[PDB]
Amino acid sequence: KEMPQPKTFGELKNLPLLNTDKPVQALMKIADELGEIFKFEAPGRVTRYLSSQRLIKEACDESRFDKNLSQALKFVRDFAGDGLFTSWTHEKNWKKAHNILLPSFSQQAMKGYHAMMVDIAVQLVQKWERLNADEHIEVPEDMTRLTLDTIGLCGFNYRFNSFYRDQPHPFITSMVRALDEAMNKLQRPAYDENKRQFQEDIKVMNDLVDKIIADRKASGEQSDDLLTHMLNGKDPETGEPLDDENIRYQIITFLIAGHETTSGLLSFALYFLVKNPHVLQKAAEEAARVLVDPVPSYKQVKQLKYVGMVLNEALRLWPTAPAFSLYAKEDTVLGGEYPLEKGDELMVLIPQLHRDKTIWGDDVEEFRPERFENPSAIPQHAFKPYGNGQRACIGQQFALHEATLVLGMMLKHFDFEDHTNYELDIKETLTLKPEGFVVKAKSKKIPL
Amino acid sequence: KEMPQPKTFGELKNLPLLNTDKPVQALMKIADELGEIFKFEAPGRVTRYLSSQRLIKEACDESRFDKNLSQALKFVRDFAGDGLFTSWTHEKNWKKAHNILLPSFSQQAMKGYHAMMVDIAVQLVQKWERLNADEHIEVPEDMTRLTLDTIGLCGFNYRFNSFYRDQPHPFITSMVRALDEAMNKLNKRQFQEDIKVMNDLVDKIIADRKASGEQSDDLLTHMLNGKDPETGEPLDDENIRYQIITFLIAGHETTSGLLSFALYFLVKNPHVLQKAAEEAARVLVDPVPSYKQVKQLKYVGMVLNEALRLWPTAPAFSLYAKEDTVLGGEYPLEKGDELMVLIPQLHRDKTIWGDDVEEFRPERFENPSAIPQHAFKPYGNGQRACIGQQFALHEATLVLGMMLKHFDFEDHTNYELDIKETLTLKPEGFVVKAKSKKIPL
Ligand code: HEM
Ligand code: HEM
Fold first, then answer.
1. B62, B63, B107: residue with CB nearest A362
2. Which residue among B66, B139, B212, B360 is least enclosed by CB atoms within 10 Å?
3. Listed residue (B310, B325, B313, B377) closest to B48, CA to CA
4. Tell me, what is one Gene Ontology molecular-function annotation carried by this entry (chain B)?
């Protein structure tokens, strides 16, 4: 009946126990001590962390709880606006864009993005093929170069050309700097430069995207990107199309929501494979057997089952957008024991949910892709790396198609060496990534 | 591409080869002679017996094959109904009960059953402590007393009190008579009376519990309170009765057989017995073992897996092809064709275990991640694998651990292994003498 809660230290509340830049990892250790639910207070606020499948299945009931805009999401809203990720469910533009954009994010729609994904995936393979004998790869950096360029191309037919540069395209530099500022504001005279830079980064992002939308409207061109879809879609409900300013926010939103979650997934999967050579061999044997043409077809990506299983198991251990927030829509009782008032906040701690031993067995820290061999047998709401319900990741099929395609190509074309005996270091921002992960590849010399 | 087949006898097909008291052992000799796959026919039935890890790993692919209700399970369904073990995977009650019960059979859930398991284990150890100098133990008989009573207490908080009797509680007599009758069919008046004795007792305990509202640590409390996450429905009272009967039927003899074969293998290999007893002595430092202490009995757990490797006490399971498919690139099957997995022969596959397959060497399980996927399957496969696996191992680890802490054992008759076959396997007539080390219990 009373909710477990870590030790409080006078006016500081539980704040002294989070003196870190890795709060999710610190919170998982607190969940290991106090269990499936605990309240966490700091001078400002109060939140309740949930870790078990049994309480997370209740918090996922949409007639009772809806998505909350955390303080992180409110700061990201200054440049992401009322795009799908930083909007409340009750805003008119949330529902309109949701209805309009769902059909363009389905499994079927992936058939139309496939060729543009293969385009960027071939540039990464060629980069690694062209490395001299004494070089090495910076994994998260290269994967991020790929995901930004793929989202840029599929989203609005724009080429950032990240594999041609040491310093990213100006849009990327401003987006990433705006994101970093939004997150650094969470732990905050001498910030006047931060403020002027943040306003400059917003105008760089808006001007470019507003220009491409206007350029596209003036030409009449039709293309296979999300921008065409939004220029010609109408919400079946209200009958209206999205307006130019909201399309710009969705474009920014695809990039900020998709770039590091997907690059982090590819980097953690490759980390798990080089630390588990037998798994790597089985995944590499599948890629060799399935990817028989010079470049993969859509249908061949769909048949890389074990590669998909490695990706889901990497997402089970380190889900790359690790926590999401919800509010009680009305007074209610959680799990028969914890009363909540309307407006009370809950946080879903995904990595801990994914280590619930009543679901997965006692061996939760082992990397075992075989856990996903039969997807129909994973219990309802046990695996939630893409969030929940109508507010779940609209880009889920896009992210799995992209990662399955790329990891398959990586395993086909190269052998990998963990030449530094890399020690895992998980940096936390809006997302997770294995900071400083580095490998050497040896080409299998298979022509593209 | 052509599959071997043992001798046929006209319209009797291969049936007559199974007119024996030890059919799985007859099947192993046929597997020894024909290899990794053979066809076996009866009047209007066909099945293919698999023995090699290479073919059985494909058989365990759930997108291609699902559990089949063999003739034995259809006879056990007359009293086990639509409980978990005798239901098709596509029956609504199979999924309902599975979703609800899964979390109550997890390793974590064993912490809630540990105290009642200890209650019955201590009753077994005390019986042996109280034997006089001129006495011996009947192993499988005492192990079955223990597993029936533990499943009865942990499943529905009911005491059979098998250590207070020469003749078992009446439910137990009807259940073992009913199982025997279903196995002999591969009578009718007695069979119907025995079903009724089982349903009357189990239906009464369920109606008593709902009337009182008491909440206890058993499986029945879980079933009265659970709701299937998918449909939102509870199990009804009839199905709850079938699950209780099913736990008793599926768990009692497989688990007591495992305990009997482990002790047998230990008295025949004294250096392994002494290494297991030295672990028990170092870990079980309290007069009442704790849940955490049982988990530290690693070599005892390896002795039990090695006993299950040689004589897996539920030795064969049946599968059917979901769609037309080819097995191992050589054997084309049609939708509905049946496969039988011969577990003892799988566990003797020299290409996985080495040439010393007949030797008892617990050290083979030192590194559990080194055993290839589908090489070791005493609990069946996938979503239709034994839901009781954690329960069975905690129980057996707890009990063997206690045995080795408290007694020294003598194979006083120099017992000659004789494996009796029913639904399960056991070492019939296995007897030993135990001398107490006089340690507080
Ligand atoms: C493996 C990669 C990814 C992961 C783990 C991931 C995870 C998530 C999560 C957990 C949410 C819900 C956030 C919340 O409840 O506050 C979300 C929402 C969202 N994601 Fe993803 N994401 C990934 C890739 C992508 C990609 C590739 C795109 C787009 C190209 C994308 C676009 C979105 C959008 C637009 C939303 C908001 C949807 C709505 O509320 O209507 N994500 N994602
Ligand atoms: C050493 C002990 C045991 C062994 C070797 C064993 C073996 C097996 C095997 C081989 C199966 C699969 C049968 C098939 O494929 O048709 C099975 C299923 C099952 N077992 Fe066990 N068993 C043991 C103990 C137990 C215990 C202690 C319980 C209950 C407390 C139990 C309850 C069940 C149930 C309910 C099923 C059917 C599950 C389903 O299909 O959903 N068993 N067992």
1. B107
2. B212
3. B325
4. heme binding
Residue B34 exposed, middle or buried by CB count within 10 Å (0-12, 13-18, 19+): middle
**What's the resolution in A?**
2.0
State residue A367 phi and psi, 5-degree precision: -85, 105
Give the nearest partner residue to B383 out of A357, A362, A377, using CB atoms: A377
Contacts of B413-422 with CB under 8 Å at 24 or more apart are B415/B264, B415/B267, B417/B264, B419/B22, B419/B25, B419/B311, B420/B21, B420/B22, B421/B21, B421/B22, B421/B23, B421/B24, B421/B25, B422/B179, B422/B180, B422/B183, B422/B253
For chain A, give every domain's residue range: 1-448
Of all protein residues, the one whose alpha carbon is nearest to atom 32 of ligand 2 is: B388
Burial class (CB in 10 A: 0-12, 13-18, 19+), B83: buried
Stated as kind and residue range, the H or E segment containing A173 is helix A170-184
**Looking at domain B1-441, what is its CATH homologous superfamily?**
Cytochrome P450 (1.10.630.10)
Q: Are A263 and A144 in contact (CB under 8 A)?
A: yes
For residue B56, the distance in angstroms to the closest alpha carbon of chain A comes to: 16
- How many Å lie between the centroid of ligand 1 and the Cα of residue A395? 6
Q: Which of A357, A374, A381 sits opposite B108 (nearest CB)?
A: A357
- With the most atoms of ligand 1 within 8 angstroms of its CB, the residue from A92, A260, A261 to mutate is A261
Technique of determination: X-ray
CB atoms within 10 A of CB B132: 5
Q: Residue B70 and residue B314: Cα distance in Å, rounded?
A: 13
| CATH T-level assignment (fold) for domain A1-448 | Cytochrome p450 (1.10.630)
Residues in chain A: 448
Where does ligand 1 bind, in terms of residues with CB under 6 Å?
A 67, 84-85, 98, 151, 253-254, 257-258, 261-262, 265, 319-321, 324, 385-387, 391, 393-395, 398-399
Here the contacts of A281-284 (C-beta below 8 Å, separation 24 or greater) are A282/A306, A283/A307, A283/A310, A283/A369, A283/A407, A283/A411, A284/A411, A284/A412, A284/A415
Q: How many CB atoms lie within 10 A of CB A128?
A: 17
